From a paper:
Multi-subunit [name] complexes control chromosome superstructure and promote chromosome disjunction, conceivably by actively translocating along DNA double helices. [name] subunits comprise an ABC ATPase “head” and a “hinge” dimerization domain connected by a 49 nm coiled-coil “arm. The heads undergo ATP-dependent engagement and disengagement to drive [name] action on the chromosome. Here, we elucidate the architecture of prokaryotic [name] dimers by high-throughput cysteine cross-linking and crystallography.
Residue numbers in the entry:
A (entry chain D): 178 to 190, 198 to 206, 211 to 228, 230 to 242
B (entry chain C): 176 to 207, 211 to 246
C (entry chain A): 1 to 15, 17 to 49, 57 to 59, 61 to 109, 111 to 129, 134 to 135, 137 to 203, 991 to 1065, ...
D (entry chain B): 1 to 24, 26 to 50, 58 to 132, 135 to 198, 990 to 993, 995 to 1065, 1067 to 1068, 1070 to 1178
The structure:
Amino acid sequence: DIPIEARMNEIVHRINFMDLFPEHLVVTFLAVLELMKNQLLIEQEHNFSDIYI
Amino acid sequence: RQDIPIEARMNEIVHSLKSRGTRINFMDLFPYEHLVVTFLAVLELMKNQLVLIEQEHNFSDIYITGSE
Amino acid sequence: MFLKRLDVIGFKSFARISVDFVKGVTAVVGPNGSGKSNITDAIRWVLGRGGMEDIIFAGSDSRKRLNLAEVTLTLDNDDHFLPIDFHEVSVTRRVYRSGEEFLINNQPCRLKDIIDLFMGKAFSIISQGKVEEILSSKAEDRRSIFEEAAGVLKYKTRKKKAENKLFETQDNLNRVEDILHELEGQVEIDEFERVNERYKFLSEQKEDLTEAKNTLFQVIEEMDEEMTKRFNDTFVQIRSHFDQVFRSLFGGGRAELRLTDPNLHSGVEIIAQPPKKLNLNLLSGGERALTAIALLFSILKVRPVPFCVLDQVEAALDEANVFRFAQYLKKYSSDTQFIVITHRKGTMEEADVLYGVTMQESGVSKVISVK
Amino acid sequence: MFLKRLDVIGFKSFAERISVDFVKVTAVVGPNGSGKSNITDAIRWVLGEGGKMEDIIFAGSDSRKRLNLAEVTLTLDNDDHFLPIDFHEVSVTRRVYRSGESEFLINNQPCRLKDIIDLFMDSGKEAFSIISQGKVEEILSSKAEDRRSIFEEAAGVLKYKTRKKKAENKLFETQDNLNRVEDILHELSIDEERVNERYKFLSEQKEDLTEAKNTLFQVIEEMDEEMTKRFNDTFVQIRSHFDQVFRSLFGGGRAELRLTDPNLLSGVEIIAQPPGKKLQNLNLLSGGERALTAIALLFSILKVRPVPFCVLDQVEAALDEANVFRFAQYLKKYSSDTQFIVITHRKGTMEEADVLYGVTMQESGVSKVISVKL
Ligand SMILES: Nc1ncnc2c1ncn2[C@@H]1O[C@H](COP(=O)(O)OP(=O)(O)OP(O)(O)=S)[C@@H](O)[C@H]1O
Ligand SMILES: Nc1ncnc2c1ncn2[C@@H]1O[C@H](COP(=O)(O)OP(=O)(O)OP(O)(O)=S)[C@@H](O)[C@H]1O
Ligand SMILES: [Co+2]
Ligand SMILES: [Mg+2]
Ligand SMILES: [Mg+2]
């Protein structure tokens, strides 16, 4: 819950999912997987490529 | 991690019994959320017959004694 | 019924341990094999993995099979939720290696004693993965899970016994009829005044039944008026909370719960639609989980039971919705006592009490607790 | 058959055309409502078996549309020609059209119903190399005489079974024949008896051909001797893998596998007695004891007849906070000779995984896929 919104407000100050990273990259992605499910986006060229928010 | 404190605590709980012999006190072994996992590890090693703990009653201060 | 303590000797993995259930959530944590699921099967064998003697410890190195297994439950009856005046109730059950028993307040009692006393913690306890047990069950077999929640089972069972009695009453009037038909011809020395000396009083003697039975049928008919009414009064109060819990779990998800036919036997049929028309068989492992879970916390809003136990009810849902089955378990900590057995730390964070179960000493389970 | 990628269109939750790239461990994340445990329904759909067949196609969310055309593809590296085909990039597709019409296609050519079976009969993508959700303990609770065949297709002995079955039918038909013609051979001035030379020409030659099918068919029926031998060779090969795998899951375990009687055709019984317990039954195991043991028995199989790619629907679902991490270790030490598809919500296996395809669901009832590597 806390890690799932600690980057939510930080998404209004667009960049890659790795731009929100410093090992815990897993959990960070897992949160973005929910926010998508809440309609709040996700861009990628193709599989396992640059992922922009 | 969860597995890392399992054996990371195995140094401070075996060397405290080799220093004072006093059982590692969960009240003393308190690192800092953390009081859940850190209890879950000791509350695991008991199945490997690696550590024993005593309680005169429930909810009483718990002391970890690794050996068997 | 306020849970106070639980003592165990000889019951499955139980090596003579006491559990002091605190106010709020108690998380029953630990790794596998500890036997924390026994802590629900004992709260089965005391209220009402074997087959008999399979309930008793048998075999572990560094120990020996026992012959007698017993469990006690100490309940604070200060508010008299039980039909006794005691402020500390203590119920115990036991089984002998010989296959032979229960005590109420340190005193022996009949078989249907504890049963009659609690009338109650079925769907009050959720064992491993049995959650979905509500959904998959047929609609005709689903209303049972409501009938207990509506207390209709008391008036119901009684009424059944009363009809059973009416059957025997008719069984007596049957022979009485033939007897009297013989007395009509036997009617028309003074020793024949001995035969009419039984029929005139046997008229008010058979009429004694021909009245009491009529005093019983009415006692059935309007007794269903207090069952068939209570079933609806509860059903709707759970209706108006289905949407509340369900939606509070799925932001924007709206669902409902309806029934079929009059009542008696009304198959309750369940519907759900996450935020998308989802036959509910097509729901995810979590979507099948947070349904019987929301439905629970709506029932827990109508007839909330004080002792409610859940065994790994959250092992099917992502950490995002574990917080759901965590906070809805952190609110109702005040209104009712929740004992959950889940190794997922997400619920173990808000749990007021942590009771760690391990197993030392070979197949023997010990207990620790902190909070 | 090194897995390459999988494309889905119109399949169940999958509405927009999306695919997944697989590596040599791939953890399929995503929160509930999404499609991760669906992707496995599609992986079994590709090779072989919601309600009926219509519920396979995207029913449609009332935020988008209602599609009526569903199809799945699979691309594999057959460099070593794992299968009886000479292609080095194989593409297998199955189609479902709302007309009630299914299709099958490989490269440029349509395929038959009972065709794609045979291509895979030797490989064993075994559907039992797929661990399902709420099925992780299936083999442990299932009856002995319902756990025998899993070894049969593990040893590969299924193809031989189809052989001896069909051969059995043939030998029956030929027996009926020779029996019927023996009755014709039994039913059989001066002028010209010239038809008897053909009668004995339609028997002494004809019963010679049929009776040449006898001795030739019962030798292919004796090829079941190879099927039973190879089976038992494997039946025993799994044996001494149990305990060693078990004992490394349960420190100090003791378990073993054994059969009933002799007469393939029998049943198998598992025995498990964890360290510092024993003396018990299978029904008396813990909730995660059955989970790990089944895991050991379905993790040791792949040390004998390994497969290319396996499926895990919530295998570590009911397990400890540690016996998952050990399950993660094992997933890493076996990820070499086979590709792993795991569906897990706990971070434990995710840390020991190579690349995750996290499944989201945006646009209402539609699944999206995002992948990341380590
Ligand atoms: N009746 C019994 N007699 C002897 N040992 C038992 C008995 N019941 C359980 N055990 C021991 O405990 C183990 C399993 O007990 P369970 O009660 O099913 O454990 P569990 O509570 O389900 O564990 P978890 O972590 O909660 S999933 C067995 O391997 C035994 O060693
Ligand atoms: N045939 C279908 N047509 C339309 N929607 C479907 C279909 N099958 C599944 N869905 C949608 O997908 C959801 C459940 O799909 P599942 O495949 O069981 O989810 P899941 O894969 O178990 O998700 P997780 O997170 O991986 S557990 C339902 O809410 C539906 O909205
Ligand atoms: Co009083
Ligand atoms: Mg359990
Ligand atoms: Mg799933």
